[PDB]
Structure formats: structure tokens, C-alpha cells
Amino acid sequence: TSAVNIYNISAGASVDLAAPVTTGDIVTFFSSALNLSNTALNLLSENGAYLLHIAFRLQENVIVFNSRQPNAPWLVEQRVSNVANQFIGSGGKAMVTVFDHGDKYQVVINEKTVIQYTKQISGTTSSLSYNSTEGTSIFSTVVEAVTYTGLA
Amino acid sequence: TSAVNIYNISAGASVDLAAPVTTGDIVTFFSSALNLSNTALNLLSENGAYLLHIAFRLQENVIVFNSRQPNAPWLVEQRVSNVANQFIGSGGKAMVTVFDHGDKYQVVINEKTVIQYTKQISGTTSSLSYNSTEGTSIFSTVVEAVTYTGLA
Numbered sequence: 001t002s003a004v005n006i007y008n009i010s011a012g013a014s015v016d017l018a019a020p021v022t023t024g025d026i027v028t029f030f031s032s033a034l035n036l037s038n039t040a041l042n043l044l045s046e047n048g049a050y051l052l053h054i055a056f057r058l059q060e061n062v063i064v065f066n067s068r069q070p071n072a073p074w075l076v077e078q079r080v081s082n083v084a085n086q087f088i089g090s091g092g093k094a095m096v097t098v099f100d101h102g103d104k105y106q107v108v109i110n111e112k113t114v115i116q117y118t119k120q121i122s123g124t125t126s127s128l129s130y131n132s133t134e135g136t137s138i139f140s141t142v143v144e145a146v147t148y149t150g151l152a
Numbered sequence: 153t154s155a156v157n158i159y160n161i162s163a164g165a166s167v168d169l170a171a172p173v174t175t176g177d178i179v180t181f182f183s184s185a186l187n188l189s190n191t192a193l194n195l196l197s198e199n200g201a202y203l204l205h206i207a208f209r210l211q212e213n214v215i216v217f218n219s220r221q222p223n224a225p226w227l228v229e230q231r232v233s234n235v236a237n238q239f240i241g242s243g244g245k246a247m248v249t250v251f252d253h254g255d256k257y258q259v260v261i262n263e264k265t266v267i268q269y270t271k272q273i274s275g276t277t278s279s280l281s282y283n284s285t286e287g288t289s290i291f292s293t294v295v296e297a298v299t300y301t302g303l304a
Contacts, residue, residue, distance in 0.1 A: 110158060
């Protein structure tokens, strides 16, 4: 039997999961706005490591994926160009879905897979965070995270 | 490689799925409104069989679950008491998740499992629908159905 957990994440905030996200599981971050005229979503481990850090950068015009340990510097950054071309026919909202596939995270923006991210740091996701720089986020102030767990 | 698909279904309509739902796949219906003070969500096979009919009846204060073959009577019905209580999580919104577990459909309202539904018709889901008794739906006029497929 599977589980659905729901979380409201304000920008700047972090949440601890009532059910960990492991191999086979799914996180979708739901935004009720799309402000494309910077912004980060994070899958963290119990010990505070960044298993997946996703940064939408409008200025540079790239989406960035990286990982790091706590108190440690960033690892090998992966970079997808052209932010707006990942939200094709999005409208005024967006969703960011992460599939935990064991060796990789699959990251899908709306209906389109944006990266098959080979994991740099492995393990269970026990926390999620969402932040932006100043009052400019490409997403709504509150992002709803939904987890689907106990799937495999 | 798994896949996310997003469908808008307005009250009274049916949508064919670009990717069929099968064993180990998920569908969630998102409603941006909740009017508890009638309303049906359906999963259908290629042949038009209702694999899962979920009907919310406020007057009778029950959630009804059933299946039926194309143009044939409703099979054995299953009922859960007290609609309002299955929704205690969110005001002004809700989700209804259906997990296809092979032999069972697990229905989850927000975070609360409401039924483990022993299938009365087997097979793959290839369309969804959403119905309401005119202008008095429990949900928003448009519901967003998100499928997570290619999971197994």
C-alpha cells in the first residue's frame, strides 16, 4: 500500500518528511504562478546533505542541478540552457517532478523530462526546501509539495 | 524513464490518456475548490468499461465506489460513510489519488486512504472523466488530472 503526503512550502522554508522519499518514490512541487520575466528546490538527506539542488536562474538563463554534503562545497554542476523552453505551454502555473530511480533522479518540468541526473550523493530523501533571492521567485510564494511513497 | 502527463477536465467531459495507466501507476485529481455544504470521477478502459467510478453524494453522506461493463448495469457497490470527514485536511481544495495496485485500486483523499478497492473489472485505464449534477459540484469546475506512468 502506498502513501500520499502533502506539504506547504513558503519561500525560505524547509520541511521534514513524515515518510522518506526513496528509490521508486516521487516528489512533485506545485507552483500556482509562473513569473518568467534566483529560485531553488531541494531534496535533502537526514544529515542535511543536498541530494538534489535545482536552481532556476533567469539572469544566466540556465537551470542548474548539483549536490553537496553539509558544510562542504558544491560538486559537479550540470547545466541545462534556456529556462523558458522547459515550461513550453505552461501558462500561469508549473509543476516540478522528481523521480527517485536509485542511481539517478529524473527531473520533469510539467510533461517534459529536463534531466536524467546521475546521483552524486546517494540515500533517502528526508527533507525538502524552497527558496529565492529577494522578492523575485519564478514560482508562487507558497509551493505545495506532494510525495508518493511506498511505491516499489 | 517515467512520465508525467497533465490533463484539464472540466465538469461533464472525458479525456483520453496519451499514456495509459497500468499496474503500479498513479492518477491524482486536483481540485482548486471544495464545496461540502452528485460529483463523480472515473477511470475507463479502452472499451469504455468503468474500471473505477468514484461518486461523492453529499445528501446521502457517502462516497460510492463501483465498476461496470460498457452499457451494462452497475456491479457490486462499495460505500464509505461521512463525506465531509474524508476531507478534514484542506479547506478550499482537495486531491483524490488512485493507485493502480494490480488487484486493487487504492483511493486516497488528500493524505487519507478511503478504500482499498477490490477490482471488479481488470485492465488498463485509457481515459478519465469528471461529472457533476449541474453547477453544484463538490470540486472546482475544472479538475487537473496528473498521471504518473511507466513506473513499473
